[PDB]
């Protein structure tokens, strides 16, 4: 069975032809449903002859890194044959070419599968804001899949596809890969290009990936990272930012006050927290401890503040013209929007630019941040019965991370004793990517037999 | 007149007590209004003086020693009101705004507050219930800027440099119309503590002064890092450093098809004049599409950048709009009307200009404009001050929301003596660069 890129790559070096990996991958999906994973699916004829096409260009001695690995695509982000719904039975939007990011993944021979389920418009970080059926955790089909990238997510940790992507505004790209014992790589605002993606918070947004391991999630990341003239969002970066890096031998990391750390009641989070927390200070690592407040204020900007005004501009039209294929949840956050003013976001921009100026203090004493990804994981009851406090909850450790131009990556860190894993995530700087992510691999591997 | 000028007279051992009470007899015997809104009183400016000479009796590095300077009255001195060029704007702060500070640990003294557009918001002096401060050059036409007492100060001989601010372009227009340098620092490069913002994410305070190096020297000692000001940005080092340009380089100018110069052909000539010396200098004419730039400029006032002015006066528009100048009033108040997400899609519309933009900055060094591309009288602007004043703002209003560097200096005068000045705008921190070529502009 596959799982990682590695093990196609090894089963392909072995003579096994992609093709009826593929046709073998899409038999599976069949015999089982489509939903609540899995939105739409690129025809079977379309995916083979994409990979036809890859394949002549492998045998003309192409360099085709990813060659015959499918992959699914969170229905927010465009692959040409196929409609973006982005989780609402009204945007009918059939797009003409790839997004820029699926383009170079497909120019490196990847095969998008097709369109995962999601939150809708991105907006949640649970999964179950959806009307294509509610995806659930892999590990326990009562609980959330988390996220918003929520069918990309359990697609990669169910073994159908080795990779995923997602995006992330508030926590999308890193909850579900928490919930789902994946990792969540959150690439620096503008490596990856915006261009083909509908988006949630323009301003903020990153497509993200999701694999098993930090090695296959930088693999996809250094193939999709790139500068897109047409994306005003979009930064040159180079070979520079996700460049693995041995950590030296003592650093320091940054954790909140352990008093006012916060995990809703579930204890057993709390005591896997502090065994990650002991595991980085053996690895060398000096525990800092500092004032969570700031980081606090910033992440309920978001929602609290003026930034949910993105997300309204993001679908104006459709909001106005057609509210009710708005998911009701979703629905009176976006519309909310409706009632702040120009006055409020600029307010809003310089009270952040303030919370930016106070967290400086932390990172001038630190080389990298460590929290948990997701304080507590919910039922799918509790979370239709409380759907917006609940979900905001999940948001508490990740949500000013865009805001204040961070790069972040999601990675496992052990599981509760009812089989629920539980995730931390490093946070670096800008274009911090590669630096994280090696510390980030070299903390999943401490103590991991091979 | 200038800096120099101090030094030479406090070096052949003129007392600097003498020169303060002199001057602030000068102001007495003619009008404190239009171009002064208040005066700090002798007997604070002489004390201020003294612990000065204590200081620089006990070794100290004062480079500013006994150099009076004037305040645009929308930044802090200790000791005077703020007024903003408000009559019912009450504010008398405790302590001197960050840059002030700076300026009085440095030996400098602030005679006082000088007039401007009220908030900042305007490019010609005209809007002020203080007196309308006039062209030094002719007194029926416009000082400029919305930094109008500060620049006719300076040109009339009073002072030697003053602080303005600019966030469309008020620190440069009053510069060009009086014959003065006006350095536009990068955002951020000097503290915004202790000024009454008007678009608190655009807004530098500037310099004003007769020459480039007079502005420098003052620019080196304002500028540095205010940890309390969430906007205020480390650079230091070189940023203000003064290399010499080298022997050929790339300036670039607006296609001729799409200059504007609005009917004044005098102005369009000396520009010309500018191009060809720069050329003379050793520079390639680059010839740039303006329209982004254009485009950028617009976002200031036809866009939501105009709610920034609403925030930072939100309560005395909402609470006592009557005391707000009436066409400073329904700018500001139309901002009422714009939404979160119309602001958002500003921002959106903004970044597609600046990576527009980026394609010309990818061909030059240095950007040379016009700093005003016409002047206007008294008169014509009372009579149409809404229109006359954007057209003052075509080449200046997009500098701050890209983000660039600036300093406008002198060009040459009109046959009817009125004088017209060239911008030079480069990107962020090439604050010294710029001013080198600016001043072997001036010179050569």
Redesign the interface.
């Given at each position: 069975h596959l799982t990682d890129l590695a093990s196609y790559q090894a089963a392909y070096a072995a003579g096994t032809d992609a093709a009826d990996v593929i046709s073998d991958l899409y038999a599976r999906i069949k015999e089982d449903g489509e939903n609540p994973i899995w939105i739409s699916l690129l025809p079977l004829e379309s995916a083979l002859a994409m990979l036809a096409d890859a394949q002549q260009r492998k045998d003309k001695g192409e360099a085709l890194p990813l060659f015959g690995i499918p992959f699914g695509v969170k229905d927010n982000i465009d692959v040409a044959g196929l409609p973006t719904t982005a989780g609402c039975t009204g945007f009918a939007r059939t797009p003409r070419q790839h997004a820029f990011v699926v383009q170079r993944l497909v120019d490196a021979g990847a095969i998008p599968i097709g369109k995962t389920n999601l939150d809708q418009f991105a907006t949640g970080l649970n999964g179950t804001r959806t009307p294509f059926g509610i995806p659930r955790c892999v590990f326990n089909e009562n609980y959330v899949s988390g996220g918003s990238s929520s069918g990309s997510a359990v697609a990669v940790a169910n073994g159908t596809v080795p990779f995923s992507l997602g995006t992330d505004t508030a926590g999308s790209g890193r909850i579900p890969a928490a919930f789902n014992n994946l990792v969540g790589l959150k690439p620096t605002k503008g490596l990856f290009s915006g261009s083909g993606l509908v988006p949630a918070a323009?301003?903020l947004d990153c497509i993200s990936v999701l694999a098993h391991t930090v090695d296959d999630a930088l693999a996809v990341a250094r193939v999709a990272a790139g500068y897109d003239?047409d994306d005003?969002?979009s930064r040159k970066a180079g070979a520079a930012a996700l460049t693995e890096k041995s950590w030296p031998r003592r650093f320091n990391f940054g954790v909140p006050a352990a008093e006012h750390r916060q995990f809703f009641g579930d204890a057993e989070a709390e005591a896997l927290f502090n065994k990650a927390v002991r595991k980085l200070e053996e690895m060398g690592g000096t525990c800092i401890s500092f004032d969570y407040t700031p980081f606090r204020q910033a992440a309920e900007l978001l929602y609290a503040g003026?930034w949910?005004?993105?997300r309204?501009?993001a679908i104006?039209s459709l909001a106005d013209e057609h509210p009710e294929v708005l998911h009701p949840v979703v629905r009176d956050i976006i519309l909310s929007?409706?009632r702040?003013?120009?006055?409020?976001?600029?307010?809003g921009?310089?009270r952040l630019?303030?919370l930016?100026?106070a967290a400086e203090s932390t990172w001038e004493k630190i080389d990298v941040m460590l929290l948990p990804t997701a304080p507590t994981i919910y039922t799918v009851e509790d979370m239709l019965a409380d759907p917006v406090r609940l979900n905001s909850n999940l948001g508490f450790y990740t949500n000013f991370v865009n805001l204040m131009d961070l790069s972040a990556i999601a990675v496992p860190a052990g599981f509760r004793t009812n089989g629920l894993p539980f995730g931390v995530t490093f946070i670096g700087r800008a274009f911090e990517d590669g630096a994280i992510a090696s510390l980030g691999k070299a903390f999943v591997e401490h103590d991991l037999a091979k």
């Open positions: 323009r301003s003239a005003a969002f003026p949910v005004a993105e309204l501009a104006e929007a409706k702040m003013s120009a006055v409020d976001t600029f307010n921009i310089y630019a303030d930016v100026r």
